[PDB]
Amino acid sequence: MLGFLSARQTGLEDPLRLRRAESTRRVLGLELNKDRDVERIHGGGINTLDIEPVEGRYMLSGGSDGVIVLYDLENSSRQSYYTCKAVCSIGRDHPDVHRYSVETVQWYPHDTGMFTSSSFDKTLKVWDTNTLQTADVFNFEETVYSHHMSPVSTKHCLVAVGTRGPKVQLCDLKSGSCSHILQGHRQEILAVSWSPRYDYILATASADSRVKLWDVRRASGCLITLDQHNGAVESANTAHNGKVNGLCFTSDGLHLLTVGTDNRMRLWNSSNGENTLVNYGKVCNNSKKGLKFTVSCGCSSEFVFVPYGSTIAVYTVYSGEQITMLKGHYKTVDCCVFQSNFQELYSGSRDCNILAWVPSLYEPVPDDDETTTKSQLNPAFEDAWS
Amino acid sequence: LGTLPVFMEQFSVPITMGGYSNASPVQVKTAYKCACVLRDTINPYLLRRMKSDVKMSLSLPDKNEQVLFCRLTDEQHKVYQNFVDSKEVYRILNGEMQI
Incomplete structure (x- = not known):
């Protein structure tokens, strides 16, 4: 630390280096609920979490009870x-x-005054956050597994919806249109995700084992189908030998992570779909519904946090190295979300807890001359062999 | 615009059923909404100028168009009345024949 502080004060290192190093050290130090509980409001499992992108102060939660908190x-x-x-x-x-x-909640990417929710009741709802009244409602033939709004699009306000139906749907909140369908997939669409780099590029994942990239401006059909073997455009390509149930772009948008029920995670070049051949080992994924997982931001290494049964596995994205297992929940974890400002991870599970994982690098320090106001050596930490 | 059956359910019926003067207020509102949605969906891909929108391509002289309501002649009125009182029209209204 003192080395970093000296190098920063003297301009030997760019202020970037201390900041990214300490952010990485904090991720390596995550500990369960160290400073912080989350209030138990839900009675059911926590399907989905979303931290507000503007300030990171607020977190929406959706659950199997249908409640949004x-x-x-x-x-x-x-x-x-x-x-x-x-x-x-x-x-x-x-x-x-x-x-x-409720299977996905997302804030409006541009201000906190609106958010969207989807559910297996076949609806997408648009909420006015100040009043908690719906402003618009969209209905579908089939149960919604996933929806996303583009994090960077200022030009359009399209919600992609993945359902049990084979066709991706696009709802335009500006016009109220919900007629537009994309017709390439053959089974239920379990994850959809807009590129954080490009306004118009949508990744879609399905039980048909295919991930397809779309440019939703076109009348042409999809651009790319991911082939895990790298050899041919559609006829047989699969990303996984199982259902593909989770997508996450890396924070720069240059790669797409995918997870599937073959118990593998795979990294892809988003500009052409080449499998980057990073191997993470077994990543346990029994989930028959969409799995939400997240990358870090602003660290020296890009980490990925992925539900691993009841644990959250942490990997280095490019090296494939497993870093730690966060070992808190009592049932399968369904989502996790990363607070980029302070490197704090929140996790939802079917055990109905939301757990905070927080950097716990060192303790409050006593003064040895104090009588009892010290940082207490609680007797629960003591042996008692007598 | 999706598939045809869906389009018919979402636009053709709602917009049609609110053109009637006996349409209920809810139908009139639902039609007005559906027409605004459809018009906003098609707008980028339909480019339609009228002659009144652009005076550059010359001008036509005035058109007077009128509808003249003629009467049936007495024998024509008999023939028409006897046809609408016919059992062919009964078979038509009873669904045994196409209209």
Whole structure:
């Protein structure tokens, strides 16, 4: 540390280096609930989490109960230990509440005043955050597994919806259009994800074992089908020997991660679909529904956090190296989300907990001359062989 | 625009059923919405100028177009009345024949 501080003060190293090094060290030090609980509002499993992109203060949660909960993550108490309290909820008393489990919540990418929700009740809903009233509602023939709004598109406001139907659907919130379908897939579409680099490029994953990249401006059909063997454009390509149930672009958009029920994670070049041949080993993935997982941002290494049964596995994206297993939950983890500002990970599970994983690099320090106001050696940490 | 059956259910029926003067207020609103949605979906891909929108391509002289309502002659009225009182028209209204 003191070396980094000296090098920064003297301009020997760019201020980038201390910042990225310490961010990486913090990710390596994640510990369960060290400073922080999250308030138990849900009665069911936590299907989905989304941290607000503007300030990172607020987290939406959706669950198998159909409830949507909005949490405040900032410690506005003066204590070193605190609870992330629920600001407000769309509970079962609300008229517009979802009838069946809520499978994706996403903030509007450009300000916090609106958010979107989807559910196995075959709806996509648009919510006014200040009032928690729906502004628009879209209905579908089939249960929605996933939806996404483009994180970078200013030009268009399209929601991609993946359903049990074989056709991807696109809803235009500006016009209210929901007629536009993409017709290339053959089974249920389990994950959809817009490129963070390009306004118009949508990745889609399906139980047909295919990941397809689309340019939604075109009348032409899809661009690229990912072939895990690298050899041919559509006739037989598969990304996994199983269902493909999760997508995550890397934070630069240059690669796409995919996870599937073959228990493998695979890294792809997003500009042409080449399998980069990074091998992570067995990544346990039994999930028959979409799996949400996340990369880090702003670290010296790009990490990926992936549900691994009841654990969260951490890998280095490019090296394939398994770094740690975060070992908290009692049932399968369904989502995790990364707070980029402070390198804190939140995780939802079918055990109904939301758990915070927080960098725990060192303890509060005593003064040895104190009587009892020290940083206490609690007797729970003591042996008792007598 | 999706598949034809879906398009018919989402636009053709709602927009048609709100053109009637006996359409209920909910139908009139639903039609107005569906027409706005359809018009916004097709707009980028349909380019349509009218002659009133652009005076560059000359101008036509004025058109007077009128509808003249004629009467049936008495024998024509008999023939028509006897046909609508016919059992062929009964078979038509009873669904035994196509209209």
